[PDB]
Amino acid sequence: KEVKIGMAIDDLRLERWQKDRDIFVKKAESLGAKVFVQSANGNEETQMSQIENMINRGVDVLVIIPYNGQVLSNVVKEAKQEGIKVLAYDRMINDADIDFYISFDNEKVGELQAKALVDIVPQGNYFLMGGSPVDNNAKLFRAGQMKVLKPYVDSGKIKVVGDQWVDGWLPENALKIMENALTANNNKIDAVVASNDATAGGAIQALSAQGLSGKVAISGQDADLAGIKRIAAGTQTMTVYKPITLLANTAAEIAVELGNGQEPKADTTLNNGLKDVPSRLLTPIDVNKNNIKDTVIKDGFHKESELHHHHHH
Numbered sequence: 001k002e003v004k005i006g007m008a009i010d011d012l013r014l015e016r017w018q019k020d021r022d023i024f025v026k027k028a029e030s031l032g033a034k035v036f037v038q039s040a041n042g043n044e045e046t047q048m049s050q051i052e053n054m055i056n057r058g059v060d061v062l063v064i065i066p067y068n069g070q071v072l073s074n075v076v077k078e079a080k081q082e083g084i085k086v087l088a089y090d091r092m093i094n095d096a097d098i099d100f101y102i103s104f105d106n107e108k109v110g111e112l113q114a115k116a117l118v119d120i121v122p123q124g125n126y127f128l129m130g131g132s133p134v135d136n137n138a139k140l141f142r143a144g145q146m147k148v149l150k151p152y153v154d155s156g157k158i159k160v161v162g163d164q165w166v167d168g169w170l171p172e173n174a175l176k177i178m179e180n181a182l183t184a185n186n187n188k189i190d191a192v193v194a195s196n197d198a199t200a201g202g203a204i205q206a207l208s209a210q211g212l213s214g215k216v217a218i219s220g221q222d223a224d225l226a227g228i229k230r231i232a233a234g235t236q237t238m239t240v241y242k243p244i245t246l247l248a249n250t251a252a253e254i255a256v257e258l259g260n261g262q263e264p265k266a267d268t269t270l271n272n273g274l275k276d277v278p279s280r281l282l283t284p285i286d287v288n289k290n291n292i293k294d295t296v297i298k299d300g301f302h303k304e305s306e307l308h309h310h311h312h313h
């Protein structure tokens, strides 16, 4: 049985997404499946059209990384009435009749970011820099972050001096937000709770412009090559490493199982507003100055030859 798989993704701007695409496809093809991948360029109407096109071409399974997780209910109904199975990849699709969800433990990611900051800045002014306002995961990171932060806020040790979501998870948007926040607070910010590496990068540039980079604690996520370099350089505090290989291989297995009418095993269910979605959650890894070698280098996520490769000479 050749399963046909349509993979509908948000974009390829964050370093991880090319690896999610490449590992997923390779494994799906190794499992005998045929895969068609499309990117929305972060446009919800492009994403709907692409999904609808996949449905019309007769895929057995849709695998979707939603740009906006709240506007896909109808297109999921279109899939279901044709007997197509739907896997939400990395980000929950809300209020939709989907069959399965796979991701990391996203609340835990948030906890790790906040904890690494309170360890070194237990008193001060905190700014909360979330991700895309239409990415369910952004809310999960925020929840995790505040689970750690709330006792400190309550006791008066920590003051939250600002919170903004970063549209599209875009470094440019993150730079501007940090620039304004710095202006509004007279550069009186001690820690930045950035929700991923790409946004941390923008923030770091605005912090540098005020002579504050290396002095303000700042969290992250994804262990992008550039993030690892920032961490080693002392300008980024930490990142949260999530082994893409594990997510993508497991997602490909689940997709093929779904395509054959099999029911994949779940760790738990998560309610998306419509139903309790069977779901699997992988373990994220705290990464800093002192465990780069033992995590990303050892796993081959970023080999030392990649870390040392000259890009411009």
Ligand SMILES: O[C@@H]1[C@@H](O)[C@H](O)OC[C@H]1O
Pocket: 014, 016, 090, 091, 131, 135, 137, 138, 169, 196, 197, 221, 222
């Ligand atoms: O890995 C992160 C993903 O989980 C989040 O939903 O979007 C931004 C990425 O950095």
